[PDB]
Nucleic acid binder design. Sequence first.
RNA 1: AUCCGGUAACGAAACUACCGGAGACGGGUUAGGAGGUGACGACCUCUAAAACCUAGAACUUAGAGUGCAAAUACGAGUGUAAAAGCACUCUAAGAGCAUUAAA
Length: 609
Amino acid sequence: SNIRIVKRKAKGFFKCEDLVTIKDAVKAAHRIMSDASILVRSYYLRWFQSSYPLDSDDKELELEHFHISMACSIVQGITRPPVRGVGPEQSVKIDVFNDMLDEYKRLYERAPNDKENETDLSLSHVLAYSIDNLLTAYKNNIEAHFSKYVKRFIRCDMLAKGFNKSEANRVAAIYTNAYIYSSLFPSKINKGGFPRVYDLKANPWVYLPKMVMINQALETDFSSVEHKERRLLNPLPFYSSFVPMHIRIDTSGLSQLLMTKDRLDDFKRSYLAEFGVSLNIKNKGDMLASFEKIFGRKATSNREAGLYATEMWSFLTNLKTCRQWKELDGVVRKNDPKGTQWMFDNAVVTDGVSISFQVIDNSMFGRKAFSREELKTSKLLGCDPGKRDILAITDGIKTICYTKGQRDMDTHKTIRLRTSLKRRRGCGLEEYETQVMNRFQKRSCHPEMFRRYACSRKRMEHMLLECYSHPVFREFKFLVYNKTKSSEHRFMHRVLETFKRPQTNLSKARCASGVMRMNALKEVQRHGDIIIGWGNWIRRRFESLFKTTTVPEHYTSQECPSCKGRCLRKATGNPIMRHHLLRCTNDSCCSRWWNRNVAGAFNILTRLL
RNA sequence: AUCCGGUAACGAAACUACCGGAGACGGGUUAGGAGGUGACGACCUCUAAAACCUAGAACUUAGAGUGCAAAUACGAGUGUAAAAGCACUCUAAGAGCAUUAAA
Ligand SMILES: [Zn+2]
C-alpha cells in the first residue's frame, strides 16, 4: 500500500480545554518507558552471568512482547502478575514476573515506592505502541553493528600484542572476510551453503550474547590499549535521553484519554441528531466494541467502515476547523502522474510541540487487506563522497564541496549548545551531569558498573526531568528538521549556477585533457539535463532534481589520468605530516600538488567519460 | 568567534600570510538608517537590534507584483521663505515519520 506523512506544528489542533491533558500524558509516557528500559537492560545482563558459554540443551534468551509489558506494570507498582489463566505454556512465564520484580528491588538501594511514578490518568493504552519501537530497535542494532564488533575485538588484540596500528586493520579484514564469507563466530546454521550474512538475518538473538562478551573484555582485558581506540558500543539500547519522546495516538487510544462517561453522552446525542442513528454504547469501555454491535447492522463495504473513524476525530479535535486542515482536505499534488487522492488515516503522532499526520491513498482507504541515449547531449559530472565533506562535485576545471561546517552554520550549532548549557547551569545540575555521571559511563555492560549509574540517576530523576521539560529543547528539535531542507536545497541550487555557464578558463587545470574541455563548454538550462555521478559509499533528495548514475570506486584514489601508473600517496619530504596534504611520488605527473577531494573526484569523472 | 571566494611558492594545507562578502533560534530590553534647514548640527519623530530576561512560532527553494512614514532667491552692508528593512498576494520546482548509532 501507499503511505505518506505530513509534519506540522501542533498549535491549534487540540481544543484549549483538552490541551492540558495531552501535555501531561507525554511526561508520564517518557518516565515509564525510560525507567522500564533500564530495568529490562539490567535483567538481561544478569542472564549473561547465569550461563556462559551457553548450554547445548537450552535456547538463547529472547525477549518477548509481554516482557516489556510486565516491566511497565512493575514500574507503576503492580503487585501481581498480569497473566490470565493457568496452563503448561504459562508455567514458566508466570514465575518470570517474580524474578523481574525481585530485580527491580535489587537495582535500587532503597525501599520501592509506588506513588513516585504512578499517575491518575489511564495512559496504559498509549504505552502499547511505545513498546513496539523499543523491540524493533534491538534487531536493528544487532544486525547492523555486528560486523563492527568483530573487527574491533581483533583490532584491539593486535594493538595489545605490540603489532603496529597500521597493519591491524588489514589483518582484521583478512580474518573478517574468511569467516563472514576463533570464538567470535558460532557454527554455521544454514545447511544450504549460503554466506554467514543469511545466518545473521535468520535470528539476531543468537549473536547478542557474543557481543556482550566482547564489550566486557574490551573494558578490562585490553587495559594497555589507547583510550581513543577503545570506543565502547551499546549492544543493549535504552532510552537515555531525558527529553520527552513522541507518542502515537489512535482512535481507540484517544477515547481512553479524553472521553468520559459524563462527556460521552454529549457525543451520543450529537451523533444521533446529525446522523439519525443511536450508538449502542452504555459505558466508556463499550466504545471499543466490534462494528457489528455498535449499530446493530453491518457495513456494506470496507471503505464504509473507514468513514466512521474520521467522524470520531472531528468531535474531539478540530480536524475540519483548523489551519492544518488545508493540506489534508483531499489535496492532490500537481506532479502526480497517477493523480492519487489522499485523505486522513485516523492516526496522529505528536510530542506536544510538533504533530505528524498520517495520510493514505483514497483507493485503499478503510480496512486495509492483510499486510540511455541522453548521455550524448546531457552534461556529465562526478562525485566523491568523503567523510570531512559530505559531498563533492568536480567538472575537471573547478571543484565545489558541501563541507561539514556549512551544515553546522545553517543548523545554528553554536546557539543550540550555548542555550542548553546556560539553561541547565542555572539550577546547578551541570556539575552532577558532567563531573559525577561521567565517572559511570552508561555504555558499560558489567552489572556492577551499570548498577552504580542506574541508582545515581534515580536519585536526581525528579530534578532532571523538570529541567529538561522546558519546551526550548523540543523547539530546537523541530528547528533542525526545518533547517535541514534549507541547507541541502541551497547547495543544490548553487550546483546549477556553478556549471550553468561554460567555463571561463581552459589552461588553469593543466591535467585537463581534450575530452574534459568538450564537456565543459556544453550549455544547460534545465535541472534534468545534468547527470551527476555517484559512488557506492542524502542521495534520496538529490535524485529528485538531477539524474544519477553509479561508478565503481575501485582504486579511484590512486590512479592518475596522465600517468603510466598509480602515483598518489600522502605528502612526504617535509618535517610536518599535515592532515590531508598529498604530493605525487614521481616527476612524471601533470600536477605535483593534490588534495583528497580533487584527487578522487577527478578519477571518478574520468571513468564515466 | 566561524562559512564562502581570490591572491603564491607546478587546482597546497587547523596557521605560510593577506584581502573581499555572510551570521549568531521566537518575544521584552540596547546602536544604525530616513525625515519639521531630503546644506551639518542645534531639538524631536517611523523602523531595528549583538549583551540580559523569558514555558515559546514556523513545510522548503528560485523568481513576479502590491503596501509602508506623518508633522538658493526676491526685494528698500539687509529680512525670511526617499534608502536599510518588513508584511501580503502569485508563478515554477519539491514535499514519510519515532528512534537506536558511527568510520
Ligand atoms: Zn599522476
